[PDB]
Amino acid sequence: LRITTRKTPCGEGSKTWDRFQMRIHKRLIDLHSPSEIVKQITSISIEPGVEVEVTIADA
Amino acid sequence: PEKFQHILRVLNTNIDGRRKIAFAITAIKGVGRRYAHVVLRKADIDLTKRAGELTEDEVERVITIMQNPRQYKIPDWFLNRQKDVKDGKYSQVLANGLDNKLREDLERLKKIRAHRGLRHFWGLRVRGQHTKTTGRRGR
Amino acid sequence: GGGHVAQIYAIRQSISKALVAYYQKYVDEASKKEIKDILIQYDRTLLVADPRRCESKKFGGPGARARYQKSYR
Amino acid sequence: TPDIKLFGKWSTDDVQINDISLQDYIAVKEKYAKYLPHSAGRYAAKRFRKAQCPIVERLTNSMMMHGRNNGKKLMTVRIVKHAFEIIHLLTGENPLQVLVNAIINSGPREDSTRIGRAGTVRRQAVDVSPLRRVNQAIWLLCTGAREAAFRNIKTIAECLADELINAAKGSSNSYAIKKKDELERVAKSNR
Amino acid sequence: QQLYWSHPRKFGQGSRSCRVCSNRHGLIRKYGLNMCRQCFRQYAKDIGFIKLD
Amino acid sequence: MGRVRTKTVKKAARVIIEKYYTRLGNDFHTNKRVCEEIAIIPSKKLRNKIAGYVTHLMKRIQRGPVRG
Amino acid sequence: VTVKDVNQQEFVRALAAFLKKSGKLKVPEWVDTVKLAKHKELAPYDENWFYTRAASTARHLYLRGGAGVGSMTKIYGGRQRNGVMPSHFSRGSKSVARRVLQALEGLKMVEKDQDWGRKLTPQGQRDLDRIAGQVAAAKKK
RNA sequence: AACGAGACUCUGGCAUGCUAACUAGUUACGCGACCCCCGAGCGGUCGGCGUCCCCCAACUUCUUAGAGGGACAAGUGGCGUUCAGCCACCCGAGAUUGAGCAAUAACAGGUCUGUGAUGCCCUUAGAUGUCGGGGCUGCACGCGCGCUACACUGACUGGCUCAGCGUGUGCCUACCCUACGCCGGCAGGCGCGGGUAACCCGUUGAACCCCAUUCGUGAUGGGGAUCGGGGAUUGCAAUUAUUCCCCAUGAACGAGGAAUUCCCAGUAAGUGCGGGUCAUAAGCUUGCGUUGAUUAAGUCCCUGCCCUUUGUACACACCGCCCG
């Protein structure tokens, strides 16, 4: 995500800008096993603010 | 070879035999290069030779195919004028008639005295354009 | 990838190394050592690669170095 | 021939440098003969690095100038292949020996520069490097063909091959051998 | 009282408003902004971004 | 060019040679790995420097006495 | 031979002539009034441009997986000089390409196959590689 | 001893080492199908061309992103007090690939029209707080940033062939990106389908460039200003022409005074594209690819800056100060 915008409010003086960036990350682990023990063990044992999305099927 | 003739006169403008046929014809007003490469092909003649190599029989046909374009199946959209306005038809206008037609539409827009004719008579730009930094004759 | 030009240098650079690798794996050293001396003599990036790629633009210019005109009056 | 590239048809053997001064900045055949003039884009990151690359390539580089022709090195090579072709039909030589004479005959022997005294223009005569001579001579003759074909029916290829003849045999019908002698005529005066 | 109070605002620079106070002039939409560039800067520290380049 | 060593390098380089004189070789790579184990240098590029100066000192210490 | 082997400048100039002999291609009436793209400033010099373009149509279908009237135009489009404004790319005509592909399909050298695009008939693929060797027979590859 | 410098963060450049992948590929067959004998042979087979078929196949080189390693003036030769360092060379990616962050003290610099930040003053019902219309585009003139041009190293018409950074409806309040089919010269219309996105658009089938015709040194077919008529799209509304398209009209301009700007390697220049603003619309700005030179390896001459010494009637500091 890029945001390239003025560094000066009410533009005056030498023309300057500022690059901000956010880096997202995705990665996924595919399991094939009963849906019970997965949904049991998955939602627990997570310390940080990190999201998880369980899917019924994809393959 | 082919020493027969060169510069000639046709309707209202003198056309040289020096240049290629299509490009030679364009000098006559109301005919652009795009308009001529059509009319030559409806006439079914070469455009790969000079205008001084055309015969009198051939050029007699050219002006007929030109001045009745709808009747030789050149489309209506491909004309200069579609429903002129207050004349009721599709038309194709050529050299000295073009100027006469043009001067009428100027006169008309000062007759009604719209914004148009006033800008014309004052000698200022008709279309949406700035005149603050555009012009000079004066300075 | 690349344009019309840079592709030509890529296909040359690969076929040069391809030939070498075939000798490096199935034939002895002294076969390919010879071939290495020949190519690297007129080296032109046959067995090596440029590290040069485009630099990133910064503001106040249309290029990375070139700048907009400056007026004092 | 099987161990040393020609030019695609033109021998780089039977090619000499007929000065002892300007060789080791003119070379074309020690192993530096190649099928085409092109580089990977290494030509300069040291002062000595400029010298090494061929004379025929240097000629192609300085041929594309003045805005609309920059970054069109392939179009430029078209003009050079016709040049040698026209030179060979027209006079009949190894057409590289033409070019080597054309470069050597166009390089100045003495040159002037500026020196600041009393807030008024005074000039001083000084000498010139062999590397300077080569750079200057390549510049001068390429300006000729560029100039001539700016309103002539003649193509730049034709103009350029004519310009190498009149340089290779001095005759002062070229833009180069004229402009060479102008500099030296100044260098005599203020010295 | 009145039979009108409003007139079509459905597009343009007047039918969107930025979150300073309903400020404008400073046309903004990006990636779901609706957020004013002056205050965006003050939320460089706040979450959405940390400056790294 | 440039790249004249700073004082942060020259301060710790002397210290590391005084108290671990025995562990030193005169090869770059061996003297690197020793500095990695007898201390932690929190950067990687910094580590590659302090080793190289430790090496360059150890050359001279095998001649007459250093005054630092 | 495969059509890959030969030059392609030569390929079209024999394939265009081939079609016009055999009575193939029912042409549109509009062919002498047609700019041919939005980014041109003139009609073609050529008087048999339709025959030439149908050659280039059938060739690309041999290579790639086949695509409709939209994609053919994108392959042909070029640069548009807008005068005083800076140049930009744009796409050409559509209704010409829509007559080309339907005219080919009348001969069954192409056919609307599955996966959103016309693909060239085995009879078509036979005829391409047949004249591909005729190129090598002619000059000498 | 401390702050700045450096160290640091990000980015580029080196991995057939490590980690693992039908929302990424490759190879291998199994193949069966299509194709042409095109080559040995006969058409089969062997070889060649891509696509479907692909797996319970094999692998991770290519693509992707994580953990690690690698470069240190390390080695050698000169030079230096032989110190700190400097120059050349081997290996090779050479000790500088480009950005982010940045001190003390100051300016009567900009911003009360970013701020439900804010003092004081003013105004507050005949309101400086709402609807309708007009204007910010009005021209005898002066200046700045740019765009397009003055042709043959070109224009024009066909043919061939290559890319990357991104972005996209389910959001603001009514709205996205588009394949495919059909109709139209074109702008465009119409019918269906996909895309929460390494999944669909898009194997982004882009330009310059490349290959073949035509024009001929002619203000020419170079240039496309001005201007007439007609057709579409957005919107509640398009007139002082919103934008887009078609035909016609065809100007200045044929390399530019005094002056002046910017730039050292994938850099300058040429050339296209994405994002930003956006109901409709970039000659702007911000990023990205593609083609890719000439010239330098220096100096204090000009302009300016850092350090020391010196002189001063200056300290509102030479734009200062001061005399008849």
User: Is D113 in a helix, a strand, or coil?
Assistant: strand
d(Cα D88, Cα D78) in Å, to the nearest integer? Answer: 16
Angle at CA of residue C58, ends C52 and C59, nearest 5°: 155
Q: What number of C-beta contacts closer than 8 Å exist between A and C?
A: 4
Nucleotides of H under 7 A from a protein CB: 5-15, 22-23, 34-38, 48-52, 65-66, 69-75, 83-87, 93-101, 109-111, 113-116, 130-132, 137-149, 151-154, 156-164, 166-168, 171-174, 178-188, 198, 202-203, 205-218, 221, 223-231, 235-237, 239-243, 245-250, 261-273, 275-279, 282-297, 301
d(Cα F36, Cα F51) in Å, to the nearest integer? Answer: 9
d(Cα A13, Cα E34) in Å, to the nearest integer? Answer: 27
Q: Which residue type, as a one-letter code, is found at position D191?
A: R
d(Cα B56, Cα G65) in Å, to the nearest integer? Answer: 56
Q: Is G132 exposed, middle or buried (0-12, 13-18, 19+ CB in 10 A)?
A: buried
Domain boundaries in chain F? Answer: 7-62
DSSP state of A3: E
* Cβ contacts of F25 within 8 Å, gap of 6 or more: F31, F58
d(Cα C31, Cα C40) in Å, to the nearest integer? Answer: 15
Query: Does any strand H atom come closer than 7 Å to the Cβ of B99?
Result: no
C-alpha dihedral, E41 to E42 to E46 to E51, nearest 10°: 40
Query: Does any strand H atom come closer than 7 Å to the Cβ of D146?
Result: yes
Q: Is E7 exposed, middle or buried (0-12, 13-18, 19+ CB in 10 A)?
A: exposed
**How many CA atoms within 13 Å lie on the side-chain side of F65?**
2
E43: domain range?
Answer: 1-53
Q: Which of G56, B135, E40, G77 is nearest to A20 (CA)?
A: E40
List the CATH number of the domain containing E47. 4.10.830.10
Distances (CA, A) of B80 to C16, F14, G123: 64, 93, 48
SS in 3 state form for chain G?
Answer: CCCCCCCHHHHHHHHHHHHHHCCCCCCCCCCCCCCCCCCCCCCCCCCCHHHHHHHHHHHHHHHCCCCCHHHHHHHHCEEECCCCCCCEEECCCCCCHHHHHHHHHHCCCEEEECCCEEEECHHHHHHHHHHHHHHHHHCCC
d(Cα G26, Cα G103) in Å, to the nearest integer? Answer: 6
- Report how many domains make up chain E: 1
DSSP state of C36: H
Shortest Cα distance, chain D CAs vs residue C44, angstroms: 6
User: Is B110 in a helix, a strand, or coil?
Assistant: helix
d(Cα D135, Cα F11) in Å, to the nearest integer? Answer: 52
DSSP state of E23: B
Q: Which residue type, as a one-letter code, is found at position G99?
A: R
- Give yes or no for a contact between B17 and B5, defined as CB atoms under 8 angstroms apart: yes
Supply D88's token pair. 């060979």
Query: Does any strand H atom come closer than 7 Å to the Cβ of B23?
Result: yes
- C-alpha gyration radius of chain F: 11
Distances (CA, A) of A16 to C11, E26, E51: 43, 17, 16
Distances (CA, A) of G128 to D191, E50, G7, G98: 77, 60, 14, 22
- Give yes or no for a contact between D7 and D115, defined as CB atoms under 8 angstroms apart: no
Domain boundaries in chain G? Answer: 1-140
* Cβ contacts of D29 within 8 Å, gap of 6 or more: D4, D12, D13, D15
d(Cα G60, Cα G75) in Å, to the nearest integer? Answer: 10
Query: Does any strand H atom come closer than 7 Å to the Cβ of C25?
Result: no
Best probe of the C interface among D32, D34, D42, by most C CBs < 10 A, is D42
Q: Which of D112, D82, D109 is nearest to D95 (CA)?
A: D82
User: Is E24 in a helix, a strand, or coil?
Assistant: coil
Could you count the other beta carbons within 10 Å of the beta carbon of residue D90? 14
Q: Which of G7, G4, G14 is nearest to G131 (CA)?
A: G14
Supply G35's token pair. 């700019």
* Chain C span 51-70 residues with beta carbon within 7 Å of strand H: 51-70
Could you count the other beta carbons within 10 Å of the beta carbon of residue D75? 11
- Give yes or no for a contact between G61 and G119, defined as CB atoms under 8 angstroms apart: yes
Q: Which of D108, D89, D78, D82 is nearest to D184 (CA)?
A: D108
Supply C56's token pair. 């990133």
Phi and psi of C9, rounded to 5°? -65, -30
User: Is F52 in a helix, a strand, or coil?
Assistant: helix
B70 — contact with chain G (CB < 8 Å)? no
Q: Can you give the resolution of this entry in Å?
A: 6.0
* Chain G span 75-94 residues with beta carbon within 7 Å of strand H: 75-79, 81-89, 91, 93-94
Supply B74's token pair. 């050149």
d(Cα C56, Cα F14) in Å, to the nearest integer? Answer: 42
d(Cα G87, Cα G94) in Å, to the nearest integer? Answer: 21
d(Cα D71, Cα D77) in Å, to the nearest integer? Answer: 12
**Domain F7-62 in CATH 1.10.60.20:** yes
Q: For helices D130-148 and D95-104, give the axis angle rounded to 10 degrees.
A: 110
Alpha helices by DSSP H, chain D: 49-52, 55-61, 73-90, 95-104, 130-148, 156-168, 175-189
Q: Which of G50, G73, G78, G55 is nearest to G8 (CA)?
A: G55
Q: Is G140 exposed, middle or buried (0-12, 13-18, 19+ CB in 10 A)?
A: exposed
Q: Is the dihedral of CA F26, F27, F33, F39 positive or negative?
A: positive
Q: Which of F66, F37, F67, F53 is nearest to F4 (CA)?
A: F53
> G33–B34: do the CB atoms touch at under 8 Å?
no
> C44–D41: do the CB atoms touch at under 8 Å?
no
d(Cα B54, Cα B45) in Å, to the nearest integer? Answer: 9
Strand-strand pairing, D111-117 and D120-126: antiparallel
d(Cα G38, Cα G57) in Å, to the nearest integer? Answer: 19
Give C 31-60 residues with CB within 8 A of chain A.
59-60
Residue D121 forms beta bridges with which residues? D116
The single residue listed with the structure tokens 């014809």 is B25
Query: Does any strand H atom come closer than 7 Å to the Cβ of G73?
Result: no
- Give yes or no for a contact between D15 and D97, defined as CB atoms under 8 angstroms apart: yes
* Chain E span 1-53 residues with beta carbon within 7 Å of strand H: 4-13, 15-17, 19-21, 23, 25-34, 36, 38-39, 42, 51-53
DSSP state of B127: S
CA C3 to chain centre: 13
Supply D94's token pair. 């190894």
Q: Which of D14, D31, D17 is nearest to D103 (CA)?
A: D17
Q: Which residues of B82-100 are buried (b: 16+ CB within 10 A; e: fewer)?
A: eeeeeeeeebbbbeeebee
Residue E31 forms beta bridges with which residues? none
Q: Which long-range contacts (CB under 8 A, 24 or more apart) does F37-40 make?
A: F39/F12
Segment (H or E) for B25: helix B21-25
- Give yes or no for a contact between E12 and E18, defined as CB atoms under 8 angstroms apart: no
Q: Which residue of C has its CA nearest to A17?
A: C59
Q: What number of C-beta contacts closer than 8 Å exist between C and D?
A: 13
- Find which nucleotide's C1' atom is closest to B120's CA: H227
Supply G116's token pair. 């959103």
d(Cα A41, Cα A29) in Å, to the nearest integer? Answer: 14
G32 — contact with chain B (CB < 8 Å)? yes
Instruction: Tell me the residue length of chain E.
Output: 53
A6 — contact with chain E (CB < 8 Å)? yes
Contacts of G42 in chain B (CB under 8 A): 33-34, 37
Chains D and C touch (3+ CB pairs under 8 A): yes
Supply D161's token pair. 């091959």
Instruction: Tell me the residue length of chain A.
Output: 59
Q: Which residue type, as a one-letter code, is found at position D30?
A: E
Q: Which residue of C has its CA nearest to A5?
A: C59
CA B105 to chain centre: 17
Shortest Cα distance, chain E CAs vs residue A7, angstroms: 8
H helix and E strand count, chain E: 1, 0
Residue B13 forms beta bridges with which residues? B10
* Cβ contacts of E37 within 8 Å, gap of 6 or more: A5, A6, A9, E26, E28
Domains of chain B in sequence order: 1-75 (1.10.8.50), 76-139 (no CATH)
d(Cα G119, Cα G62) in Å, to the nearest integer? Answer: 8
d(Cα B14, Cα G104) in Å, to the nearest integer? Answer: 48
